[PDB]
Write a protein that binds this ligand. Structure first.
Ligand SMILES: [NH3+][C@@H](CCC(=O)N[C@@H](CSCc1ccc(Br)cc1)C(=O)NCC(=O)O)C(=O)O
Ligand SMILES: [NH3+][C@@H](CCC(=O)N[C@@H](CSCc1ccc(Br)cc1)C(=O)NCC(=O)O)C(=O)O
Lengths: 203, 201
């Protein structure tokens, strides 16, 4: 039995949820605070043998899995969406690591208030440019960052801009390949239904 | 094989440690040794096609590799210091990700000038305890984090505390397994020699 534990938010769990949706995998989506999230989280840590007292936690039977990035890589490798060669697996990894750099900057701004000006004027346009150039290098209909098949890097980049656009909607106007890519991912047979019918608000 | 970074440990030191451990020969190219670091990095970016205008960059022939964690995972698989099973590779990955969380906190304090007291009183002993408990788990009853051979997770944890100890010696008094683990790594021939040469030898 597969259980995902996180707060009632998208945040560090949403890419995992997107991956489960894409892969057609059955799981329980357990969210703290759907009463008191604070008390529930305290109870959770005492009940479960957590390595770092953080969520997301993925529990597969009696297996406890922690660290969102490790979980992402574990699933993508298991279900063949990590790239279809050793180098492509690297490139997928490199792109996901890049997503993490800019996502961290967005999180600090969106969540923990650090003024948005720097992010919006300096970080976001510059990083959008990096991703645009990476897509151009590999560029249907279909838009992949790595090879000629969907990788978790595609889902990661999709999730990044989906998260950013919840707070800042007009972020992709100047980046046509990136816009197209994110449109492509959102309309994938297994993604479309999940994204449109998941409860709003995360972070 | 050419590694490009600043003349600093930072985000390149684990890669350097891994190369040292594996006995792989490479050119360790550092900005600002012979000239202006700010200027050399500007020219580097114009000359080399980097994906995110960041270093470290590992260049194999014409192949450009970026992102330190990606490089680390890639090298670990290439030279079999990854996990010895699917789940073991997960655990090594998870621990490396844990290292990133606490290392980030150290970097904010050590380099980026912020709140040393929160790191020292609330982050470091708590994360050291997490790592100590992970070490206890792998031994169970009756050194390594994952399996009974060295993984990149071992080297990542070593580098973490090695970095911390340059500012805060010695954070490992209360954590004997972690103390023993890191002592063991530092005394491996290839590692010991890299360390002594690093401090000029
Ligand atoms: N490196 C870990 C980070 C996990 C983490 O920080 N988890 C927080 C989640 S709540 C806070 C928060 C909310 C949104 C984002 Br985006 C990031 C962080 C936690 O459990 N924290 C436990 C605690 O604070 O005691 C991972 O990727 O799995
Ligand atoms: N996620 C990337 C991060 C690399 C990075 O931030 N690289 C800086 C190095 S200089 C700054 C710095 C120094 C020490 C630490 Br610790 C972290 C960051 C850079 O090139 N930055 C290019 C730039 O700032 O224009 C990686 O792990 O490869």
């Amino acid at each position: 039995n597969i259980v995902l534990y996180y707060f009632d938010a998208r945040g560090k769990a949403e890419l995992i949820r997107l991956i489960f949706a894409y892969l057609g995998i059955e799981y329980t989506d357990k969210r703290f605070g759907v009463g008191d999230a604070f008390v529930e989280f305290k109870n959770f840590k005492k009940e479960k043998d957590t390595p770092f007292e953080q969520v997301p936690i993925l529990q597969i039977g009696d297996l406890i899995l922690a660290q969102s990035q490790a979980i992402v890589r574990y699933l993508s490798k298991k279900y063949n969406i990590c790239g279809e060669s050793e180098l492509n697996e690297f490139y997928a990894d490199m792109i996901f690591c890049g997503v993490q750099d800019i996502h961290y900057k967005f999180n600090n701004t969106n969540l923990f208030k650090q003024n948005e000006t720097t992010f919006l004027n300096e970080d976001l346009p510059k990083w959008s440019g990096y991703f645009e150039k990476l897509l151009k290098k590999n560029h249907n209909d279909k838009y992949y960052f790595v090879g000629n098949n969907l990788t978790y890097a595609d889902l990661a980049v999709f999730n990044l801009y989906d998260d950013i656009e919840t707070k800042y909607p007009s972020s992709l106007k100047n980046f046509p390949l990136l816009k197209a890519h994110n449109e492509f991912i959102s309309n994938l047979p297994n993604i479309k239904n999940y994204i449109t019918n998941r409860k709003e608000s995360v972070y």
